[PDB]
Each structure stands twice: as C-alpha cells, then as structure tokens.
Amino acid sequence: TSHCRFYENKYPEIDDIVMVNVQQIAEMGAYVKLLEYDNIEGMILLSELSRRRIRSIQKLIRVGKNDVAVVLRVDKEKGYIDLSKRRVSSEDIIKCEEKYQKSKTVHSILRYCAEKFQIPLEELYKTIAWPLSRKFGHAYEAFKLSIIDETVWEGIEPPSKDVLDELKNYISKRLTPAVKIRADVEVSCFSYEGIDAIKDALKSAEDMSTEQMQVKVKLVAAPLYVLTTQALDKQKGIEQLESAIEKITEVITKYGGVCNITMPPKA
Amino acid sequence: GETEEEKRKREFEEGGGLPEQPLNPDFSKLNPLSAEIINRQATINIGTIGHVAHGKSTVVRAISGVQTVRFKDELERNITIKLGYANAKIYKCQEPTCPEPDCYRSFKSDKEISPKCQRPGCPGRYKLVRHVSFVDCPGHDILMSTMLSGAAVMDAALLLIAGNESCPQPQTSEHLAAIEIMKLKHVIILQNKVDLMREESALEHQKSILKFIRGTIADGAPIVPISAQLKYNIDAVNEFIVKTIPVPPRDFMISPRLIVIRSFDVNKPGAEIEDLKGGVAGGSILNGVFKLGDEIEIRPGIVTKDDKGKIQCKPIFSNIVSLFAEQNDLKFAVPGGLIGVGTKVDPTLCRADRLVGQVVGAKGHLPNIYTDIEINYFLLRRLLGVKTDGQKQAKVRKLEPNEVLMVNIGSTATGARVVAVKADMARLQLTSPACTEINEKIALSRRIEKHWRLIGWATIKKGTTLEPIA
Amino acid sequence: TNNPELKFRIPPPVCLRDGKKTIFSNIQDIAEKLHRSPEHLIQYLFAELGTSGSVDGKRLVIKGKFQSKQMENVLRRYILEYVTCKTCKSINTELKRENRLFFMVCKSCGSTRSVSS
RNA sequence: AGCGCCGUGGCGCAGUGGAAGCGCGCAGGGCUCAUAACCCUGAUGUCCUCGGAUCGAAACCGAGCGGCGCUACCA
Numbered sequence: 001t002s003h004c005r006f007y008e009n010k011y012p013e014i015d016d017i018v019m020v021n022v023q024q025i026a027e028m029g030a031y032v033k034l035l036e037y038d039n040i041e042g043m044i045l046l047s048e049l050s051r052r053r054i055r056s057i058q059k060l061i062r063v064g065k066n067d068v069a070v071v072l073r074v075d076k077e078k079g080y081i082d083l084s085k086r087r088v089s090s091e092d093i094i095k096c097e098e099k100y101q102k103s104k105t106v107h108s109i110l111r112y113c114a115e116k117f118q119i120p121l122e123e124l125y126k127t128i129a130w131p132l133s134r135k136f137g138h139a140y141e142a143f144k145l146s147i148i149d150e151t152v153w154e155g156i157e158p159p160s161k162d163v164l165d166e167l168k169n170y171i172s173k174r175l176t177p178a179v180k181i182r183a184d185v186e187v188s189c190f191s192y193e194g195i196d197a198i199k200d201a202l203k204s205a206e207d208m209s210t211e212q213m214q215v216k217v218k219l220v221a222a223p224l225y226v227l228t229t230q231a232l233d234k235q236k237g238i239e240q241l242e243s244a245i246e247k248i249t250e251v252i253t254k255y256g257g258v259c260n261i262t263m264p265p266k267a
Numbered sequence: 268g269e270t271e272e273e274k275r276k277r278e279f280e281e282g283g284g285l286p287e288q289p290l291n292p293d294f295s296k297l298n299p300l301s302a303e304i305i306n307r308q309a310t311i312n313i314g315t316i317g318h319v320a321h322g323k324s325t326v327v328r329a330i331s332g333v334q335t336v337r338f339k340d341e342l343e344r345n346i347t348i349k350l351g352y353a354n355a356k357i358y359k360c361q362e363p364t365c366p367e368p369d370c371y372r373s374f375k376s377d378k379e380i381s382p383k384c385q386r387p388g389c390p391g392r393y394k395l396v397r398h399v400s401f402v403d404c405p406g407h408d409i410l411m412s413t414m415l416s417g418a419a420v421m422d423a424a425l426l427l428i429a430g431n432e433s434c435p436q437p438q439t440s441e442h443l444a445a446i447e448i449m450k451l452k453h454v455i456i457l458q459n460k461v462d463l464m465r466e467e468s469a470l471e472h473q474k475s476i477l478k479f480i481r482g483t484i485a486d487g488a489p490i491v492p493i494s495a496q497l498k499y500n501i502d503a504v505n506e507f508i509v510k511t512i513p514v515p516p517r518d519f520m521i522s523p524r525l526i527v528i529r530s531f532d533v534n535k536p537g538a539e540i541e542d543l544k545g546g547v548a549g550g551s552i553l554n555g556v557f558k559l560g561d562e563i564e565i566r567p568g569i570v571t572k573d574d575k576g577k578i579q580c581k582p583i584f585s586n587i588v589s590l591f592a593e594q595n596d597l598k599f600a601v602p603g604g605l606i607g608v609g610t611k612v613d614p615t616l617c618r619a620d621r622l623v624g625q626v627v628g629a630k631g632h633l634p635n636i637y638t639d640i641e642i643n644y645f646l647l648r649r650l651l652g653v654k655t656d657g658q659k660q661a662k663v664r665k666l667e668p669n670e671v672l673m674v675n676i677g678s679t680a681t682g683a684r685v686v687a688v689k690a691d692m693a694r695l696q697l698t699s700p701a702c703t704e705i706n707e708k709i710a711l712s713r714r715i716e717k718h719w720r721l722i723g724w725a726t727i728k729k730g731t732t733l734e735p736i737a
Numbered sequence: 738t739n740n741p742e743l744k745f746r747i748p749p750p751v752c753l754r755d756g757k758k759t760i761f762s763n764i765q766d767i768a769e770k771l772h773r774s775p776e777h778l779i780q781y782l783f784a785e786l787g788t789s790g791s792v793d794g795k796r797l798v799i800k801g802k803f804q805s806k807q808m809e810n811v812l813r814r815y816i817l818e819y820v821t822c823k824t825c826k827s828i829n830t831e832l833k834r835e836n837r838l839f840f841m842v843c844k845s846c847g848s849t850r851s852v853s854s
Numbered sequence: 855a856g857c858g859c860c861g862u863g864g865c866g867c868a869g870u871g872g873a874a875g876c877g878c879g880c881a882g883g884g885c886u887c888a889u890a891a892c893c894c895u896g897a898u899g900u901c902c903u904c905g906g907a908u909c910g911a912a913a914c915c916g917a918g919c920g921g922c923g924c925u926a927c928c929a
C-alpha cells in the first residue's frame with residue numbers, strides 16, 4: 001500500500017528539485033514515476049536529458065534505478081510534470097539525494113506503523129507527518145528531537161495511543177545514535193610516586209561518569225592514555241573530558257611529575 | 268592415562284617444587300650456592316659474543332630454553348638493541364655410573380629442585396650445582412654502547428666463531444678485547460657451525476683459532492664445537508662452565524649499589540588502570556643485598572637544562588615494590604645477577620630507552636655525580652672491527668682536544684669532549700650526566716669511520732663533582 | 738649416525754603452454770616432495786607473477802603466457818628461499834603461525850626465523 | 855597486548871537499513887567485405903562466522919575468525 005507522498009499537496013509544485021525512479025525510454029525521453037513524490041509519471045525530453053551529446057543514451061539512464069530530477073512546470077489541470085535531468089546544479093544534486101534519504105527514512109517508519117495497525121499510510125502521514133514537517137521543517141529532525149525530547153508530539157492528535165507508543169519504540173530502536181569523543185593525554189612525569197597518582201587520577205575521572213555517558217580512561221601505552229566518551233548530545237563530552245584533564249593536572253602538579261596533552265576532546 | 272600436564276606436575280612436586288625463600292635468613296652464613304639462593308636466582312652472568320648473523324640467541328635457547336623472543340617488528344630479523352636474558356639451571360646427575368660428559372643438564376628456570384634423569388636407564392636425580400643468567404650481547408658494528416654495558420654487567424664470557432666463514436672475524440676480536448678490558452679471563456670458545464664442515468676443514472679452523480689466541484691476555488681458553496641449531500653437545504658446555512669458571516668474589520661486605528641497563532614500564536594495555544603496577548628498572552647488582560621493600564635513588568635520573576643552559580641533576584628517589592628475579596618474587600636479592608627492581612616510579616621513565624646504563628644507590632649512601640672527569644687512558648696499536656683488504660689494520664692516532672667521543676663509564680653511555688691531552692691522562696667534559704662510585708672500568712670509542720670504534724681503556728682518577736638538588 | 742645421506746627432491750616442473758592457457762600438473766608433486774602445503778605455494782606463485790586463473794584437477798590452470806623456463810625459475814626462487822634454509826642444508830621446516838604473520842620453525846634444528854614476505 | 859580499517863563476482867569502489875550492485879576483466883552477439891574503434895546481452899556472490907531488535911537484514915548492534923596501520927615491547 002505504497003502511496004501518500006512526503007510533501008504537502010497532491011501535485012508537485014513548479015521550479016523545484018526532486019529525484020525520480022526511471023522505468024522506460026520509449027520514443028522521446030523518460031516517463032518516470034517519482035519516489036520523491038507519490039506515484040505520478042513525469043516527462044523528461046531527451047533534450048532536457050543529456051548535458052553532453054551521447055552515442056547510446058542508455059548509459060546515462062540506467063533504467064530501473066533512481067536519478068536526479070527537476071520539475072519546472074506542472075499541469076495543474078489534469079496532471080503533467082514538465083521535468084528535466086540536466087536542469088540541476090552540480091552541487092545541489094547531493095542536496096537532492098540527502099533530502100530523499102531523509103524523506104525515505106521517514107517513510108519507512110510510517111509504513112511499519114501502517115502495516116502494524118492497518119491504518120492507511122495517508123492517515124498516519126496526515127495526523128503525524130506534516131504537523132512535524134511544519135513545526136520543525138522536517139519529520140526527520142522531528143524524530144531526532146523526539147528521541148531526546150518528548151515535547152515533539154505535544155499538541156498533535158494521534159489516531160490512537162497504540163500507534164504512538166509503537167512508533168516511540170521504533171524511533172528508539174531504529175533512530176538510535178552518541179558520537180565517540182576521544183582524547184589522548186601524555187604523562188611526561190619524571191617524579192617518584194607516579195603509578196598511585198595515575199590510579200587516583202583515573203579514580204577521579206571515572207567518578208565523573210554519569211549514568212548516560214561513561215568515561216573510561218583506557219590504557220594503550222605508558223605515556224599515551226586514551227579518553228573514550230559517548231557524547232550523547234556532542235556537547236557534554238568535551239566538558240567532561242576537560243574536567244578529566246584538570247583532574248589529571250591537579251594530581252600531577254603536586255606529586256612532582258609533569259603531564260602534557262596530545263589530543264584534546266574531538267568528536 | 269595421565270595427561271602430559273599431570274605428568275609434568277607430578278615430576279615437579281616429586282622434584283621438590285620451588286620452595287619459598289625465607290623472609291629473613293641469616294645473611295652472614297649465606298653463600299651463592301645456598302639452597303635458598305641457588306634454586307630461585309642466578310648468581311653468575313654469562314655473556315654471548317659473536318659475529319653478526321651467526322646465532323647467539325639460539326645458543327642460549329639451546330642451553331636453557333628461555334627465548335630472547337626478539338622484538339620491534341623491524342628488529343625481529345636484523346639486530347636487537349636491548350640485551351637478551353635467560354636463566355638456566357645447571358643439574359648434575361648424582362649417579363657416578365652415568366658417563367661424566369653427559370651427566371650435566373641445563374634446564375629452564377621452572378624446573379624442580381631434583382628432576383629425573385632423561386638418560387634411558389638411570390633412576391638417579393639431578394642436583395642443582397648452580398643457576399646462571401645469560402646476557403645476550405649484540406654483535407653489530409654500529410651498536411657498541413649496549414655491548415660495552417652488558418659486558419660491564421657480566422662475569423663470564425662465551426665466544427662464538429663460525430667455521431665455514433673466514434677465520435679472522437674482526438668484531439669477534441673486538442668483543443674479546445672488550446672483555447679483556449674489563450678484567451675477565453674466563454672465556455669459552457664455541458664453534459657454532461661444525462656439522463657443515465668436513466673433518467679436515469674443522470681441524471684447520473681450530474688451528475687458525477688457536478693461532479689467533481697467542482698474543483691476547485687470555486691464554487688457556489677452552490674450545491668446544493657445538494651447534495645452536497642441531498642442539499647437541501650441551502652437557503660438556505655446562506661441564507666447562509662449572510669447572511673453568513668459579514664465582515667472582517662477591518660477599519655481603521660491600522655497600523649496596525645498582526647499575527640499571529634496561530627499563531620496563533608495566534602497563535598492561537586493555538586492562539583498567541585501577542589495577543596497575545609500578546615502573547621496573549632492569550638492573551644488575553655487583554654489590555649489595557636487597558630485600559623486599561627498600562628506598563633507592565637513581566643518581567643521574569632527571570636531567571634538566573635551565574634557562575642558563577646549566578645541567579641540573581635530580582636523583583630519582585624510589586621505593587622498591589618488588590625484586591623480580593628468575594621466575595618468582597624473591598624476598599632478598601643476590602649480587603651478581605640481573606634483576607627487575609620494580610618501584611613506585613612512573614612507568615613513563617621505563618617506557619623507552621631511558622634507564623639504559625644508569626647508577627642507583629639505596630638510601631644510606633651518597634655517590635657523586637660529576638661534570639668534568641679526570642681519566643687515565645691506554646690504547647692499543649690498531650683498531651678492531653675493520654676488514655682492511657690486506658693492508659695494515661688502521662693504527663690508533665693520538666687524541667685531539669675538543670673531540671666528541673663515546674666514553675662508556677661502567678654502563679653509562681656518554682658522549683664526552685676532551686679538554687686536554689697528556690701522555691697518559693685526559694680530562695673529559697660530559698653533557699650527559701655520569702656518577703663515580705669506586706673505579707668504574709671505562710671503554711673508549713672514537714668516530715673515525717662513521718660508526719663508533721673501540722680504541723682503548725681507561726679509569727677515572729679525579730673529577731669535578733655536582734651536588735644533587737634535594 | 739643421524740644423517741647417513743650427508744635439494745635432490747625437486748620434481749621436474751613439466752608444464753603445458755596451451756597458447757592462451759597454461760596448465761601445471763606437477764603442482765601437487767612439488768607440494769609433496771618439498772613438504773609444502775598447496776595453498777601457500779600457489780598464492781606465492783600468484784604473488785610473484787600478476788596472472789590470474791584457477792586450480793583444477795591437482796593442477797594449476799593459469800591463462801597467461803609464460804615459458805616453462807620462467808615458471809621453473811620462480812619455483813627455483815621459492816625453493817632457494819623457503820623450502821631450504823640458506824645457512825645450512827635442511828628441508829623439513831614447514832609453515833607455522835607464531836602476532837598474525839607466518840613465522841617459520843624447523844624440526845631437524847628448532848629454528849625461529851621471521852620469513853613472511 | 856589495545857586502538858584505527860576491512861571482510862568480492864577475478865579485480866577496485868561502492869548503497870549499505872527492500873534483498874544484488876557500477877566500472878575493469880571474460881564468454882557471446884551486433885556494425886564492417888574484413889579488422890580494430892564503437893554498440894548490446896550476459897554467468898560469477900556464504901558482501902567473513904555465530905546470535906539479536908526488526909515483516910525482514912548483507913546493512914542496525916553485540917561473543918568469534920581472518921587480513922590490514924599505528925600505539926610500541928606495553929616485567
């Protein structure tokens with residue numbers, strides 16, 4: 001039951017960049033369905049197709065797969081999509097693909113919820129999807145804020161609480177991320193009691209580990225000590241690790257030894 | 268139906284096991300052959316010398332069974348900078364019935380007090396005549412500080428000559444002269460390759476080797492043909508070591524000292540740091556009986572340069588965590604055997620080649636670091652280690668003022684400058700710190716042909732001391 | 738006593754050059770008479786010469802152009818530096834894996850040499 | 855010993871969250887009188903092992919293997 005395009009309206013708009021799936025090259029160009037959009041076939045003419053003149057056009061089409069696209073004019077009376085392939089910026093193609101991955105990945109969870117609760121995908125989209133794409137500009141960042149901050153659905157009417165809690169499980173299972181921040185600290189100590197200092201320094205550092213983010217000063221070498229941290233929001237790890245740095249500097253500046261930093265906190 | 272591991276256990280407990288050393292034995296009545304000393308530590312250091320790429324690790328492995336392993340990926344194959352250590356247990360069969368040449372047996376360090384005789388037909392057991400340590404000396408023409416220092420450690424010598432190659436190997440003679448410099452006579456000559464020669468070739472090689480040993484200080488050197496690979500004729504080597512080579516004078520009268528040659532940080536990676544261990548100095552003790560728990564000071568230690576370019580020397584005070592010798596942790600340490608003194612020192616001091624050739628003294632003695640040293644030198648006629656293609660082995664010149672030269676003071680590998688030259692006396696200024704304790708037999712090498720070259724020996728006569736900052 | 742015989746056990750590498758194709762049947766025999774496992778020998782052969790094929794049957798089928806002299810020479814190199822040690826005459830050594838590479842050890846002697854590449 | 859990389863179709867890259875990819879190779883065909891150039895069709899996979907959420911993973915993760923680079927010898 002694949003339908004219900006990601007965007008607002010039931011026909012694509014004008015002068016926008018999309019991405020199609022290619023099916024046929026019969027006489028004049030590609031009449032192609034849209035996976036950036038619902039189901040509607042759109043035209044590209046072979047003149048609106050090839051930047052370089054070609055011997056066999058098929059090498060640039062590769063029927064069956066997905067390709068960059070631009071809708072210029074839309075027949076908003078009975079349905080026609082004036083579309084082209086070459087009418088896209090060299091860089092903005094990657095914007096088109098990344099937009100498509102966001103939209104497609106949003107579609108996957110909604111399809112899962114629809115095939116579980118047997119609500120047509122259009123209803124789940126209507127209740128949930130576009131209010132999210134309106135509050136936050138996209139449903140993907142809406143899901144990203146929902147995994148961390150549960151205020152996202154506050155003010156959105158769901159068909160049922162079952163759809164809600166199931167999709168919360170699905171966002172916590174599929175959209176699960178925490179970037180590994182790493183540091184490397186040198187011990188340059190030439191002092192007398194250094195091993196006990198190192199033990200106490202790691203005691204202090206690992207005593208900073210919070211429930212969600214655990215800091216473990218693992219050993220790889222005598223000088224080089226590694227700081228591994230799961231930065232869940234990519235901002236607490238650096239301050240945790242700076243606190244660790246200060247703790248080792250504290251332990252080291254009084255026993256008699258010296259220590260130095262090689263790799264500061266980086267994602 | 269006993270497993271081989273069960274069999275080896277049963278023999279180990281049958282052989283008396285490895286009894287724990289007494290915590291406080293009466294040290295006045297202890298000799299290096301005593302049961303508590305002989306079973307769990309090595310009292311005589313034997314060092315291997317030979318030509319490059321002929322096999323000195325392999326001979327030690329064939330004797331004891333303890334691998335030098337060899338390390339550092341690239342150094343796995345060419346040469347190793349650090350020394351190679353191994354412990355052998357010298358066992359003699361108590362039965363007179365077995366032939367005398369094969370009664371001797373050298374086992375690994377984990378053997379029992381009295382293991383059974385592997386000779387088929389003898390129920391007699393083996394008595395421990397001595398335990399020995401081995402110091403594998405690198406024999407390359409570039410690596411000279413480590414060989415001199417390892418010499419400065421050892422007390423017995425072991426010369427390897429290959430048969431099929433040319434007789435007069437020059438750096439073998441350099442090794443022998445370096446041994447002669449430190450006042451050793453006890454040298455055993457080995458023929459590494461004997462299976463690969465004919466009867467006549469082997470005799471000709473023996474004649475050549477004898478013809479070499481007439482002018483050197485060593486006169487009555489034993490010569491024995493062995494094989495590191497085929498692993499035969501091991502018992503008679505032990506025979507010659509036991510008969511020819513006695514224990515150097517080493518009793519408990521002399522004040523405690525240490526001479527560190529190797530550094531070993533103890534940081535098992537992957538393990539959490541809350542379960543760690545101190546830094547270990549691999550050091551040899553020529554004088555001093557050390558017991559579990561002691562305060563010791565690495566005299567040259569921290570070497571700093573101030574804003575004014577002056578060298579400041581901060582001794583590394585340290586408390587001994589343990590005295591790792593042979594196999595097990597030992598309550599007391601025996602002079603004349605390399606030991607890992609593990610102390611509270613930060614392992615970053617013992618990671619790389621940092622504690623290589625450094626003097627240490629327990630608390631209760633004040634050795635003196637120096638910056639200028641008076642030295643009394645004496646040179647040989649020619650340089651050793653240069654295969655001149657038939658023309659008059661290079662003659663040693665007279666030293667020049669202000670020349671950087673490698674002066675191995677005991678174990679310390681230092682590059683000093685000559686400030687004055689006399690008939691037999693010189694003065695050396697050091698940038699790398701060196702201390703003086705008693706005499707510290709010194710080896711001298713110059714830079715004439717790129718790499719260092721031995722020239723002659725020397726002993727300190729005087730020096731300008733430095734007072735360590737407390 | 739131990740070695741009355743003191744290599745002489747290299748099978749003559751009789752090959753087949755079928756123009757576009759090449760078939761070497763002796764690959765198993767040279768594997769046996771040199772006490773060498775087949776896969777390591779064939780991968781060493783492929784590492785010497787950048788040619789591709791398959792292994793068929795107890796034989797090596799490489800579709801490329803080489804005279805029997807040159808593959809004989811490659812086998813000669815492998816014999817010189819792997820099956821028999823340069824320093825002393827021996828052959829009973831075989832592949833072992835001492836911390837991930839192939840570290841050679843012997844049986845007649847007890848060698849430990851780091852020959853991998 | 856730990857960390858950074860990887861797990862072919864003959865190769866190198868790859869999308870790795872719908873389930874078999876692209877070029878280089880190789881077999882075959884087409885154009886040409888004929889060859890090269892050019893044009894079309896292909897069969898090759900345990901996308902390394904074992905389990906797990908998942909309709910479902912090759913993909914998302916982990917209890918093991920193998921091969922790569924460093925930390926460097928890490929008693």
Ligand SMILES: Nc1nc2c(ncn2[C@@H]2O[C@H](COP(=O)(O)OP(=O)(O)CP(=O)(O)O)[C@@H](O)[C@H]2O)c(=O)[nH]1
Nearest residue numbers: 319320321322323324405406407459495496825850
């Ligand atoms: N034929 C033969 N080969 C030997 C013998 N002893 C050792 N070898 C060879 O020497 C090799 C090991 O050499 P190695 O001990 O590393 O040399 P090295 O001690 O590092 C030389 P240096 O002390 O100057 O550094 C082995 O692969 C072995 O084949 C022997 O008695 N006969």
Ligand SMILES: [Mg+2]
Nearest residue numbers: 347350351403
């Ligand atoms: Mg060695």
